[PDB]
Amino acid sequence: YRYTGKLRPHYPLMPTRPVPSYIQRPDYADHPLGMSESEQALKGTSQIKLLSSEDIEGMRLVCRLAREVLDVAAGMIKPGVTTEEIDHAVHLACIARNCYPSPLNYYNFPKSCCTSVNEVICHGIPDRRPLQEGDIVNVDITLYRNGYHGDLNETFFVGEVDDGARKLVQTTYECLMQAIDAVKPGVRYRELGNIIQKHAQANGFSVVRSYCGHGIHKLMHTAPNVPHYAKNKAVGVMKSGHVFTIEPMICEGGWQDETWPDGWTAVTRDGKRSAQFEHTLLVTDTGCEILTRRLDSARPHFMS
Ligand code: MET
Ligand SMILES: [Co+2]
Ligand SMILES: [Co+2]
Ligand SMILES: [K+]
């Protein structure tokens, strides 16, 4: 395998961490290949759940806990800390909140969160590599509580970063917030990518095509599929009670991705950097509720 950049995985990984049986587990947690039968039973449907009020309450709670856990991770970002160390803390913080770390054994993913450094677009696997000054690192947190998933990520700076990094990260965050601002009953899901690419392209960056935002509630990944690039063919119109993520991945160079031999880590083909932000959003009668927002501080961690 020919690496596309300077990043390498750092093995061995620690044995997978167990989750106490008193925490409720998603279906895939105990499937030998991590398959989610509940997801597969809806494969290829474009029909979108309209959430009940109980469902809404379950999403508010899990998404709020998910944010608390991301914040724990943000507090640990510094040169010298390994991504495994961050994952171990995430793992414990999930459990302290009586939640299952949704990534754990999802299609056999080995860890409890994704840590994506520099050229890693998404789904990097926490490992023995210490963060280095000048790195940018995304932590993606997904929690499962009382039958609901909640999902968010942010890109963080490690010590001081270059101007390229700041611009990349700032623009990615703007892309996300500009898409969120357009969310309300009656908007086509396909529109969000027109907004995202327009801003990304205006800043010289590209938009990853192989990974999309998604519905999330009782299932971790479900309808709608939500592309972040322009003139996509996404099916559906937003309605009050829809819940889904927006999670744009933007790249300094080209948009093309490939996957490491590990089956997960997605990297730019050109080895240039990529950044990402994500929220889970509830479409209301008039706009949208950002379920995974910070409740206590105005800005994302990188601006603080
Ligand atoms: C290894 S599963 C990680 C999934 C990620 N949290 C997402 O938003 O799709
Ligand atoms: Co996510
Ligand atoms: Co997501
Ligand atoms: K990255």
The domain that holds 43 is classified in CATH as 3.90.230.10
Residue found under tokens 């499962």: 144
Question: Is the alpha carbon torsion for 92, 93, 94, 96 positive or negative?
Answer: positive
Of the listed ligands, the closest to the CA of 115 is 4
Distance CA 124, CA 85 (A): 14
Q: Quickly list H helices, the chain.
A: 37-40, 53-75, 83-96, 163-181, 191-202
Give the 3-state secondary structure of residue 185. Answer: coil
Among 87, 113, 140, 155, which is best to mutate for testing ligand 1, by the most ligand atoms less than 8 A from CB? 140
Residue 48: CB atoms within 10 Å: 22
User: Contact at 8 Å (CB) between 49 and 238?
Assistant: no
The string of DSSP codes covering 249-283 is EEESS---EEE-TTS--EEETT---EEE-BEEEEE
CB 103 near ligand 1, within 6 Å: yes
Helix orientation angle between 191-202 and 163-181, rounded to the nearest 10 degrees: 150
Domain ranges, residue 48: 1-304
The experimental method behind these coordinates is: X-ray
CB of 247 closer than 6 angstroms to any ligand 1 atom = yes
Which residue's CA is the closest to the ligand 1 atom numbered 2? 103
Count the domains in the chain. 1
Q: What is the rounded end-to-end Cα distance, in angstroms, of the chain? A: 39
The candidate with the shortest Cα–Cα distance to 176, out of 303, 85, 56, 5, is: 303
SS3 47: coil
